[PDB]
Amino acid sequence: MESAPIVLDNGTGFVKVGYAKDNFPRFQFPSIVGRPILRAEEKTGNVQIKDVMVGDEAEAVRSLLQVKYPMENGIIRDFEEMNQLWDYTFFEKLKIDPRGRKILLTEPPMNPVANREKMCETMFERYGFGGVYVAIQAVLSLYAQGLSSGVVVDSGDGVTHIVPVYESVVLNHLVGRLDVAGRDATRYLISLLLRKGYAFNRTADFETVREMKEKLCYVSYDLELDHKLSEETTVLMRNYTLPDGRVIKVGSERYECPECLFQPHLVGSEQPGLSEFIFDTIQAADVDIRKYLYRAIVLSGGSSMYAGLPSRLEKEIKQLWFERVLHGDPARLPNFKVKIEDAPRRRHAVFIGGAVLADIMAQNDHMWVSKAEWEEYGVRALDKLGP
Amino acid sequence: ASFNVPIIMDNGTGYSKLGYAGNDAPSYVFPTVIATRSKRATEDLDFFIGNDALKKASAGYSLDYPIRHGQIENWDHMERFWQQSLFKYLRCEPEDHYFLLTEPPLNPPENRENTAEIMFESFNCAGLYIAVQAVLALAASWTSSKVTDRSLTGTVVDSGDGVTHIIPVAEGYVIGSSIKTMPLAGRDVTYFVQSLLRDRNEPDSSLKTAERIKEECCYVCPDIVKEFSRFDREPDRYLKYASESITGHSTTIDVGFERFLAPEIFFNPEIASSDFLTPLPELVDNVVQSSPIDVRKGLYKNIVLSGGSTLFKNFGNRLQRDLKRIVDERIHRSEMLSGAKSGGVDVNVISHKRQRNAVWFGGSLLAQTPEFGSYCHTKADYEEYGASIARRYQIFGNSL
Amino acid sequence: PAYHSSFLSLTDVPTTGNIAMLPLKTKFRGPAYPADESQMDIIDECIGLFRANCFFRNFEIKGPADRTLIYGTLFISECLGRVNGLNYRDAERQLNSLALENFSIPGSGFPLNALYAPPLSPQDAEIMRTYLTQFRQELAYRLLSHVYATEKDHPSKWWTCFSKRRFMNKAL
Amino acid sequence: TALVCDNGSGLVKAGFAGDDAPRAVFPSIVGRPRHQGVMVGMGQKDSYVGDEAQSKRGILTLKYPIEHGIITNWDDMEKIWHHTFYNELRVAPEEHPTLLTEAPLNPKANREKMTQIMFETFNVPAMYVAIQAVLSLYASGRTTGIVLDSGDGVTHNVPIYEGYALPHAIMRLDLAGRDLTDYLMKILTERGYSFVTTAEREIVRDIKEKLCYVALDFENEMATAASSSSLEKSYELPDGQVITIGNERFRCPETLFQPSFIGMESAGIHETTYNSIMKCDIDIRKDLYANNVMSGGTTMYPGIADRMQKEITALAPSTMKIKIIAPPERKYSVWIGGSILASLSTFQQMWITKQEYDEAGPSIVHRKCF
Amino acid sequence: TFRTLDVDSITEPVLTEQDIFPIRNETAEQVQAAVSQLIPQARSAIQTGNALQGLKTLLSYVPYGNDVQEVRTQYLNAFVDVLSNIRAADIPAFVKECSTEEIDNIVNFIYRGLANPQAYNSSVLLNWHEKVVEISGIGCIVRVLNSRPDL
Ligand SMILES: Nc1ncnc2c1ncn2[C@@H]1O[C@H](COP(=O)(O)OP(=O)(O)OP(=O)(O)O)[C@@H](O)[C@H]1O
Ligand SMILES: Nc1ncnc2c1ncn2[C@@H]1O[C@H](COP(=O)(O)OP(=O)(O)O)[C@@H](O)[C@H]1O
Ligand SMILES: Nc1ncnc2c1ncn2[C@@H]1O[C@H](COP(=O)(O)OP(=O)(O)O)[C@@H](O)[C@H]1O
Ligand SMILES: [Mg+2]
Ligand SMILES: [Mg+2]
Ligand SMILES: [Mg+2]
């Protein structure tokens, strides 16, 4: 294929993988590992299950598997299962020998140091990569825009994180985590459907409500209007057929599920939701740069894909500036400019930006942490990878 | 509000407990069952309820339980059950009295709406409080009504006939994000006892005989492979139960491993169900570990038991030891990383003299409060807004 | 959860397909390595766990020792189907006839052909059959010492009740 | 008795003039329940303050009505003042004249609304609103000094000589214990610990008060922490869970000397103090170096006085005798100084009375108070 | 809290009805005079027993506008009074000789009549509705749905 640097978005819900200059993931698959189970469920001779089965091999066959996730909240929870994802990623998805290759990895901005350390150790000491770079996921989503300033908010399966950038300087003191994302919204959909008498407690059923959420949920633009369509009308009602063949009815849960991003208290969090987390972040930036951050609020990651989320977010920031800056005086509201950037490709902006950055540093061999540098400095070799 | 005593109705899946605020017991405790017929039309007058419905199966009435898995699902039958509760048993006029009702924490907005229109339009009650049921069961746990005896923080495990739910409450506030429910309770352990009598082809496997074998013969063991082995090692572990048939003759039933294997439904729900898998000690851990960090000692220090299906011999001791194992293994993982011993946490599971009817006794104690009539919907609220007044969830966080 | 084989803690065990040919106490002829007569082996484990395990409806397999315990668990359900109303002597001859008669191995009408591997060579199939025939003859002979423990001319009802408790909804 | 109330940006301190410690000291917090699920008639209410807000905190959202020394919420600050009078001191405030405290370089509207609420809602006979740093000087038995006060929301330097303040040389920094607690909640994420609720903020403040310290030489303590666990300590969470903390113990307080750790463009407290004395005239510059008074709870760290001394002696010329004055009571010194001032004979003519407030309105506080 | 503050009503002004429908090219007193010339002809045609010519003349002009409710209601009073005085056997012969624009005006003003039964007799308006829709088809109601809001 090519001698290029490999780029790997080892995300909490999905792995995405490919090479420098790729305009889209070469492969993308669930970051899941499966073990064989029997469960008072259908069985046939038309398949065979190995003692470890992962990614697409697990997701297509998950009725037969104990499904587990090697990651949660942007951190590796189990490196023994993460080793099985990385084996699968290199040896039977890419079908590559890692020996002496250079690889670009990704993580969110406020992880434990042990996550990056043991992840780089694994690249040098299981796979024998010749060099590694680890990039902050949301600065890659800005490389995908071809853009040097704006506040970039990335919401995936594990974490929602925000990174203000101005004139290519990253405002590291302003970066933050909202510990609500696509998995919390999926756990909330299970909780809301449980009030309707449905049950989804099997490890294989989490991917079923993920696909249901991803098909049927949307962000209410106006809560009292969606509550009116919900309580006065049947128009929000929708049928979903599970891979069982069972049919379930879903109504208010379609707007009530993703509302936990804009109202985290619905999932028990005390943090402010997306609009107020983004506003408190921009409003903490210096006076001379606030306008440039409001004129480029860059959305990223799969949990930014709910229908109406850009519309609600733009409105709710105008509405929050009107409360907290103008104190309810209409006369200056038309002068406040905000622009949500909401590209079609934005679920993959971290990969697409990693494929840009990995090309920009492909020839600059000193930019990567080397295997020869790792084996003499250990974890102190990673002090190259920013502050 | 009126100066007349509030009327307390805990309508469970198995049993309805009916009475007046401030009494030392419910006035009635009888099954939540209706017996119905299956030139003027009067077949909606001809029904019976409770103990008097159980007497009517031989007279050709069809019995039904209008509450199943904690939720009302037949509003015709629940309206007739309430009118007969009010006018036969409680012998009261709704226009003179305020009512305390109950339902599970999950229960649909639709159920509280349907409940309010029957109470305010069919019966025309003066006012209605629909209580969060296991929050009342915390208040029944006090040693006396005096403020110095109150323990406003505790986990409550309620297990009745139809559903079991674990509720964290702290400083008197319900942490609704942390509610856990297991869809299995006292009826599913009866269907399991019944299924085991039926697998042995015993002379009787009627539902009353499987029920009576739970109440009298069943208990919670430490471990079912050790207890199966004890039923080889010791011979008087098998009991003989004498039962009388529907057509009025004697029978004798050998009762065996269902004595320990049937209460194991709570500690291994993979025995009961394909659809629920997490055992009750792990499910109580998930309630306290999802709950805010400053209330976790208080929630483990006071795990109140509630509802009839928590009364199995050795149940609270199995829950306490298995949860203490989960809790200390999690604390020791942290001591072994840090190189310093903790203070630990005491896990206390609390069984108490009012445990059988803790929701009703709590409802009685809370309806005695001077403020109570201000927490009710009054019929004057219902005349303005209708049944929509009761629709909003009390226990969970609402959008809007 | 359900109970798994203590012999999953063993290592470098002989194997065919992905059955473990575990150490076995027996007097029947075949390939299985003689266990210690003083210690529990997989058949003392398989019968001791069976009447708990047959109630669970979810089971995750840790390795080839559990694949062996499952095949035994399914064969105890077959034996308790075959045994009913017999004298102990008639039951020994009926359940040896059941153990000996031609059965499907994994890789052939086998009920769990997704969870078990086919035999790794044309010769691995013969060692898998000659192990499974010896195992299930011993498993039949050992079960009868429990179901005819207290009386000898009728099978104990405290064992015959599991005859319809179909483990994980699977049967041979 | 006059009352003395220190309007602490994180910690209210209240008592009677001529007493030698606060009668009451408590969090400047109002807490509100984050759950609508309730027990009827059960002693259960719309807001909690002070020690009720701390003891109930797991189910509350906690907010301080003061941020950076400025009252941002007046409806909750009047609950805090109501609680100081009617619940902590157990007095009717209309019987007692009240000394209040203020930070230098605050909004004038803060001091106007603070005199207005005291006469118009608490009905006091008389009141006064002193700058905190001159009270901390009067608490220490001296008329010359440069006072480094450091509370929850503000830190400020006031040069004062022969009882005359030098207001052109005053420095103020919007960095103190709130910002150090924020930065500790931030850097504890690197150990893998997530603290995000307004209740967990109070746990991390307790970690900070119990275990954090000022490094005497920071890059040597960093090299020490990289070499050994002898620097690491353990903390018992309210969960019974054990937390381990290492270089975060001294990286947290280093922010006070290196504000750029939180992205803030400022001099650290050494350079701020140096530039404050260096902005005073050369004859006074001889003396205040021997009288660097430290005040407020953010000056309470282990090692802070020795490192404040080793830093300020590298900026000052080598002929100077430098002293850091850091009493063990420094947490309360602005209150102890207010207790002294409200007890002085010559102070009784310079209160603001209810009569001259009725004759002038709330703008009178700018002609009566420094 | 911020969620309830209407920002859209001031940051994105929506289309008005006069952006969809063209402005009336006549003043309020100019249309009020034009109708005040027609109502006496419509009344007079009832007294001579020529109520069919009473409608044909009244229908030659129609008032519209949110500034003219008084003269619109006076025109509707005359319209319902004229329709109430035409014999039910004359309706089929009259409807088939109306233009598509006269039919559109008849079905529009029977709709304004049906909206106010305490003033207007619905029984004759429903009889006119049956016959106008039977002869001219469904499209005449479709033209009323699509019609201007200040008719
Ligand atoms: N159209 C959609 N509507 C709603 N949710 C979506 C949609 N598309 C994807 N998601 C959700 O986004 C999540 C996956 O997004 P993404 O790949 O960006 O996460 P990730 O990178 O793996 O996670 P993280 O960045 O936190 O480590 C899943 O929860 C998925 O269901
Ligand atoms: N001593 C007991 N031991 C075990 N279960 C019991 C005992 N006494 C009653 N039960 C069971 O408790 C259940 C009824 O409990 P209850 O709290 O009244 O349920 P519910 O409120 O949901 O109707 C029934 O399944 C009943 O058989
Ligand atoms: N021993 C200590 N070591 C470090 N910080 C302390 C110590 N004691 C208190 N603090 C800090 O003191 C601050 C409160 O100081 P205080 O002088 O009372 O401020 P304020 O008057 O403005 O409310 C809190 O942020 C607290 O974390
Ligand atoms: Mg991602
Ligand atoms: Mg119940
Ligand atoms: Mg202070």
mmCIF file of N, CA and C in Angstrom, chain A residues 30-36 51-59 62 65-71 78-86 88 203, chain C residues 60:
data_model
loop_
_atom_site.group_PDB
_atom_site.id
_atom_site.type_symbol
_atom_site.label_atom_id
_atom_site.label_comp_id
_atom_site.label_asym_id
_atom_site.label_seq_id
_atom_site.Cartn_x
_atom_site.Cartn_y
_atom_site.Cartn_z
ATOM 1 N N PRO A 30 -16.260 -0.698 16.020
ATOM 2 C CA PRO A 30 -16.448 -0.538 17.455
ATOM 3 C C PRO A 30 -15.198 -0.919 18.246
ATOM 4 N N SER A 31 -14.807 -0.113 19.227
ATOM 5 C CA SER A 31 -13.720 -0.451 20.142
ATOM 6 C C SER A 31 -14.232 -1.428 21.200
ATOM 7 N N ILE A 32 -14.553 -2.646 20.770
ATOM 8 C CA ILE A 32 -15.121 -3.711 21.594
ATOM 9 C C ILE A 32 -14.327 -5.000 21.454
ATOM 10 N N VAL A 33 -14.327 -5.773 22.526
ATOM 11 C CA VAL A 33 -13.758 -7.112 22.620
ATOM 12 C C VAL A 33 -14.837 -8.046 23.143
ATOM 13 N N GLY A 34 -14.956 -9.218 22.544
ATOM 14 C CA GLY A 34 -15.949 -10.233 22.848
ATOM 15 C C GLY A 34 -15.316 -11.544 23.293
ATOM 16 N N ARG A 35 -15.952 -12.198 24.263
ATOM 17 C CA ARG A 35 -15.638 -13.563 24.710
ATOM 18 C C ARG A 35 -16.838 -14.472 24.450
ATOM 19 N N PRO A 36 -16.648 -15.757 24.117
ATOM 20 C CA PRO A 36 -17.757 -16.660 23.824
ATOM 21 C C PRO A 36 -18.701 -16.856 25.020
ATOM 22 N N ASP A 51 -11.864 -17.731 20.934
ATOM 23 C CA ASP A 51 -11.756 -17.375 22.363
ATOM 24 C C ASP A 51 -11.577 -15.872 22.639
ATOM 25 N N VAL A 52 -11.153 -15.105 21.631
ATOM 26 C CA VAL A 52 -11.210 -13.639 21.572
ATOM 27 C C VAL A 52 -11.706 -13.226 20.188
ATOM 28 N N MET A 53 -12.719 -12.370 20.140
ATOM 29 C CA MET A 53 -13.310 -11.868 18.903
ATOM 30 C C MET A 53 -13.611 -10.378 19.064
ATOM 31 N N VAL A 54 -13.238 -9.510 18.122
ATOM 32 C CA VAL A 54 -13.163 -8.055 18.386
ATOM 33 C C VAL A 54 -13.637 -7.209 17.204
ATOM 34 N N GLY A 55 -13.908 -5.924 17.431
ATOM 35 C CA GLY A 55 -14.238 -4.980 16.362
ATOM 36 C C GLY A 55 -15.475 -5.376 15.555
ATOM 37 N N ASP A 56 -15.370 -5.373 14.226
ATOM 38 C CA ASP A 56 -16.459 -5.810 13.345
ATOM 39 C C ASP A 56 -16.804 -7.297 13.504
ATOM 40 N N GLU A 57 -15.839 -8.146 13.866
ATOM 41 C CA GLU A 57 -16.093 -9.579 14.027
ATOM 42 C C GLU A 57 -17.002 -9.832 15.231
ATOM 43 N N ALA A 58 -16.808 -9.068 16.307
ATOM 44 C CA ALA A 58 -17.700 -9.067 17.451
ATOM 45 C C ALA A 58 -19.038 -8.393 17.124
ATOM 46 N N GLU A 59 -19.060 -7.198 16.524
ATOM 47 C CA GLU A 59 -20.312 -6.433 16.401
ATOM 48 C C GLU A 59 -21.341 -7.113 15.487
ATOM 49 N N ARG A 62 -22.599 -10.253 17.874
ATOM 50 C CA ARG A 62 -22.695 -9.938 19.318
ATOM 51 C C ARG A 62 -23.747 -10.700 20.125
ATOM 52 N N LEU A 65 -21.677 -13.253 21.908
ATOM 53 C CA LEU A 65 -20.533 -12.733 22.674
ATOM 54 C C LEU A 65 -20.943 -12.066 23.994
ATOM 55 N N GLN A 66 -20.099 -12.226 25.008
ATOM 56 C CA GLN A 66 -19.966 -11.292 26.125
ATOM 57 C C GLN A 66 -19.185 -10.064 25.645
ATOM 58 N N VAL A 67 -19.874 -8.981 25.282
ATOM 59 C CA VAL A 67 -19.235 -7.752 24.791
ATOM 60 C C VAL A 67 -18.652 -6.944 25.955
ATOM 61 N N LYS A 68 -17.390 -6.525 25.841
ATOM 62 C CA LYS A 68 -16.720 -5.588 26.748
ATOM 63 C C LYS A 68 -16.009 -4.482 25.974
ATOM 64 N N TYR A 69 -15.873 -3.325 26.605
ATOM 65 C CA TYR A 69 -15.245 -2.139 26.032
ATOM 66 C C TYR A 69 -13.910 -1.879 26.748
ATOM 67 N N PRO A 70 -12.754 -1.902 26.057
ATOM 68 C CA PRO A 70 -11.454 -1.635 26.672
ATOM 69 C C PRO A 70 -11.289 -0.210 27.207
ATOM 70 N N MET A 71 -12.140 0.725 26.780
ATOM 71 C CA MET A 71 -12.103 2.138 27.147
ATOM 72 C C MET A 71 -13.408 2.628 27.767
ATOM 73 N N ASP A 78 -8.895 -1.436 30.510
ATOM 74 C CA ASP A 78 -8.256 -2.757 30.472
ATOM 75 C C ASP A 78 -7.290 -2.882 29.291
ATOM 76 N N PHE A 79 -5.991 -2.830 29.579
ATOM 77 C CA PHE A 79 -4.952 -2.939 28.561
ATOM 78 C C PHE A 79 -4.862 -4.335 27.944
ATOM 79 N N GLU A 80 -5.295 -5.400 28.621
ATOM 80 C CA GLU A 80 -5.272 -6.743 28.037
ATOM 81 C C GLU A 80 -6.259 -6.864 26.869
ATOM 82 N N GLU A 81 -7.410 -6.203 26.968
ATOM 83 C CA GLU A 81 -8.387 -6.115 25.883
ATOM 84 C C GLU A 81 -7.994 -5.049 24.854
ATOM 85 N N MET A 82 -7.349 -3.960 25.271
ATOM 86 C CA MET A 82 -6.818 -2.974 24.329
ATOM 87 C C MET A 82 -5.702 -3.559 23.446
ATOM 88 N N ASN A 83 -4.867 -4.448 23.990
ATOM 89 C CA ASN A 83 -3.898 -5.226 23.217
ATOM 90 C C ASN A 83 -4.582 -6.075 22.138
ATOM 91 N N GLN A 84 -5.759 -6.634 22.413
ATOM 92 C CA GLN A 84 -6.504 -7.423 21.442
ATOM 93 C C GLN A 84 -7.105 -6.540 20.336
ATOM 94 N N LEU A 85 -7.590 -5.330 20.655
ATOM 95 C CA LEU A 85 -7.946 -4.333 19.637
ATOM 96 C C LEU A 85 -6.755 -3.928 18.767
ATOM 97 N N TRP A 86 -5.605 -3.606 19.351
ATOM 98 C CA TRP A 86 -4.440 -3.178 18.582
ATOM 99 C C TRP A 86 -3.865 -4.300 17.709
ATOM 100 N N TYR A 88 -5.716 -6.718 16.377
ATOM 101 C CA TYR A 88 -6.699 -6.755 15.302
ATOM 102 C C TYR A 88 -6.539 -5.593 14.313
ATOM 103 N N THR A 203 -25.088 -7.307 27.808
ATOM 104 C CA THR A 203 -23.951 -6.576 27.207
ATOM 105 C C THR A 203 -24.067 -6.405 25.684
ATOM 106 N N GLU C 60 -20.524 -17.826 30.431
ATOM 107 C CA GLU C 60 -19.360 -17.377 29.657
ATOM 108 C C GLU C 60 -18.220 -18.382 29.834
#
